Design a protein around this ligand. Structure first.
Ligand code: 2D1
Ligand code: 2D1
Lengths: 193, 193
């Protein structure tokens, strides 16, 4: 009953490691979760909607993980704070590469995939600006760029660059170097200047 | 003869201001340039190949423009040097928004659009790292991150963020704020930490 949903979801995740959404049919999703095509249609309107449910769970996992960090401050320097935060995304999306890759491709195609991405980006940017602002108020960060514009550009960098790394794109920062790379750019631009 | 090619190219550019490639047919390209469908096929294999020729000319215009700057150093501070360079891309792509937007969408679909992008990105990154390195050698920039990894991340930021701005995406930096925003992040991260 609820198993079947999870099974359809685990099946699409597995099949996306090997091939793109366009190359996975409803039939393959049904088969893999051990159910018929019309039983599939009872849980999902389309394969597309399977991607979106997967993407939704990744995005919320990153989100919840970032909330957790916010409710319990790590006893540490300013560099490590930023690093820990950026690491929520590196680990969460980086443990879900096929879904990341496919969810990103679907922004071109699906207005809901586009709007789910857009909603959380705005949320993660507003939080980065709140923290930059907090940092400015206590006198640790200088008042340079508008905090919101700086956070916008830093979030957008992290999106393209984390995602280029996970996909092994040319060019990209090697995955084992990407965290350090982002964290130097966040910390120099936030504290410098 | 050669007019016809330019006319087909100017027509696709115009039609892309209003609608996506998928919504422009070969027929519309033919009509707009004042020729038949089969006369179209004599200049181009597909609409797709029309996009790619347009994208090729934009990319080379940015490229040539960046070469020019390199052959005649502006008599100026380090911030303005970077600003002038980033401005080549802001102006070039930003004067060609529909082609930018469509060329970017086509990376998902066209291996040649993907490979043309990938080739110039590698070139623009190698040049940014050469200049960062040069800057380190003269003692103006500190040896922090590997120059090539830093340039990778800065180029990728500029791509997503310039392109998000030109498309009016949510979120995005306002277009009238994006240059200043990028330039503070390049200069703090290159000279800081
Ligand atoms: C200590 C703190 N870190 C953050 C924070 C850290 C990283 C990011 S992020 O890496 O820029 N995430 C948004 C884009 C993802 C799709 C890759 C966003 C916010 C906010 S407060
Ligand atoms: C003074 C100099 N500036 C550069 C330089 C400046 C900007 C950029 S760039 O803005 O990062 N361009 C590559 C991506 C485009 C599609 C947006 C790349 C290199 C190299 S040397």
């Amino acid at each position: 009953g609820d198993d079947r949903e999870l099974a359809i979801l685990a099946t699409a995740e597995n099949l996306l490691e090997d091939r793109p959404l366009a190359d996975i049919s409803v039939d393959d999703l049904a088969k893999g979760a051990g159910i018929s095509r019309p039983t599939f249609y009872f849980y999902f309107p389309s394969k597309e909607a399977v991607l979106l449910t997967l993407l939704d769970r990744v995005v919320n996992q990153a989100d919840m993980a970032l909330q957790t960090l916010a409710e319990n401050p790590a006893d540490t320097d300013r560099e490590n704070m930023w690093r820990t935060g950026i690491n929520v995304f590196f680990e969460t999306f980086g443990s879900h590469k096929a879904v990341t890759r496919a969810g990103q491709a679907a922004r071109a195609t699906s207005v809901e995939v586009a709007e789910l991405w857009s909603t959380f980006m705005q949320k993660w940017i507003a939080y980065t600006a709140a923290v930059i602002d907090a940092e400015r108020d206590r006198g640790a960060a200088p008042r340079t760029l508008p905090a919101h514009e700086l956070a916008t550009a830093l979030n957008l960098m992290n999106e393209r660059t984390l995602f280029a790394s996970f996909a092994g794109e040319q060019p990209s920062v090697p995955e084992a170097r990407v965290l350090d790379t982002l964290v130097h750019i966040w910390v120099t631009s936030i504290y410098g200047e």
